[PDB]
Structure formats: C-alpha cells, structure tokens
Amino acid sequence: DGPEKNYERTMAILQIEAEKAELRLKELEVRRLMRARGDGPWFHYPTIDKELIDHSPKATPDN
Amino acid sequence: SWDKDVYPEPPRRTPAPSPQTSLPNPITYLTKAFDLLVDRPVTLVREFIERQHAKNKYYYYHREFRRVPDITECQEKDVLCMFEAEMQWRRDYKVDQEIVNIIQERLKACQQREGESHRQNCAKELEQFTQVVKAYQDRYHDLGAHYSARKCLAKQKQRMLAERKAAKEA
C-alpha cells in the first residue's frame, strides 16, 4: 500500500470508532435521564386519552 | 562510503619495515601473490560491474517525517491528535535505539583498535556511551511492553516532580 495510505486510512478508522464510542456513552446518559424524568420520547408510557371525555350537558347539572 | 564524523577513526600510523634479517619475509611474497592472483582479477570483475551501473543511474531518498504536535499538546481522549503524537513518539523511540547502537559501536571499535592500551585511550568513547545510556534509560526504561507516549510522559512527570522536590530540599 505505502505508509501514507495506511496512516491516513487509520485516522479515518479511528475517527469513526471514536465517534461511535462517544455516541454509545451519550445514549446511556440520555436513557438514564429520559427514564428518570419521563420528559422525552423514550419511556413514554401511555395515559388515558382526553378525547374520550364527553363534554355534553349531562342528565344532572353538577358535573 | 560512510560519514567519518558519525563513525570516526583516528589517523592510521603503520611503521615502515626495518628488516634486521637476511632471510626473505614469506609474507611479502604472499602479499604479491595475493595482489596478482586474488586482488587484480577481483578488481577487474568489479570494474566491469560498475561500468554497467554507470549506464543506468537512478536514485532513492531518505524519508523525511515532518514534526507534529507532541502528546503533551493532545487533549484527553482525542484519538486523532493522539494517533499522530503516538506514531511520532514511536518513530523517535526507534531512532534513539539506533543512536545508542551507534555509540555502542564507536565504543567497541575503540576497544579493539587501541589494543592493550584501551583502558586509557577509550575514555572519551566510554564517557559518551555512559551519558547516552543514561539519557536513554531516563526516557524509556521501565515502561513495559505496552509502552506509549502517555506512559513515557507520566514517567517524565514523576521524575520532574522528584527533581523539583529535591531542589527545594536543597
């Protein structure tokens, strides 16, 4: 190959592997916060949908 | 053929023959036979070969590595900068090995050359060998098989802190 090709091919490999390693460590922290706080897309457990409520006047006034 | 400054040799002093005998010296007649039978035909063959090399002359070069920032300038976990500093440190490590080899060969050649007077006449070569081996030991000794620029730098800082502490003690 030649040293320059191998040398600069190695930097490309290292960049990809370091970018992946950082992303792996960040996903763990994001998962910890989302699960703990419930304020993100993940760990979003459903609640009753409010579009099922009937708002028409009822047979009695107090409600 | 080689740099006489890198591999020095003192001027040669062979004494002129002063034969105090009448018997012929067989070693002078064997020298002439050697020159006639061995040297001259060997020289002729080489001169033919060198003529062919002259017809086709091409060149090769000594690779020059530009300097890149040391590991001291690399941010933690920054592999791209660490990679170039680490590779440079490895190249320098290999070059320092050959520097010690050069100084060891100077010392060994002096010992053989000075003969029975080597203990006195090779003091300079011994002193230079002693100093370079010390400097090499300080840089690279005790790092381990998994050595790196990081571990070399950590060793340097340990030594620097001790020296700073010893300076205060004095």
Of B80, B84, B87, the CB nearest to A15: B80
Distance, in angstroms, between A26 CA and closest chain B CA? 15
Distance CA B15, CA B53 (A): 38
By what technique were these coordinates determined?
Answer: cryo-EM
Judging contacts by C-beta atoms under 8 Å, the chain A residues touching residue B84 are 11
Do residue A18 and residue B83 have CB atoms under 8 angstroms apart?
no
Angle at which helix B149-169 crosses helix B123-140, to 10 degrees, equals: 110
From residue B146, give the alpha-carbon distance in Å to each of A10, B50, B140, B150. 19, 47, 12, 11
Identify the helix (H) or strand (E) that includes residue A10: helix A3-37
Distance CA A41, CA A35 (A): 10
SS3 readout for B3-62: CCCCCCCCCCCCCCCCCCCCCCCHHHHHHHHHHHHHHHHHHHHHHHHHHHHHHCCCCCCC
Q: What is the resolution of this structure in A?
A: 2.4
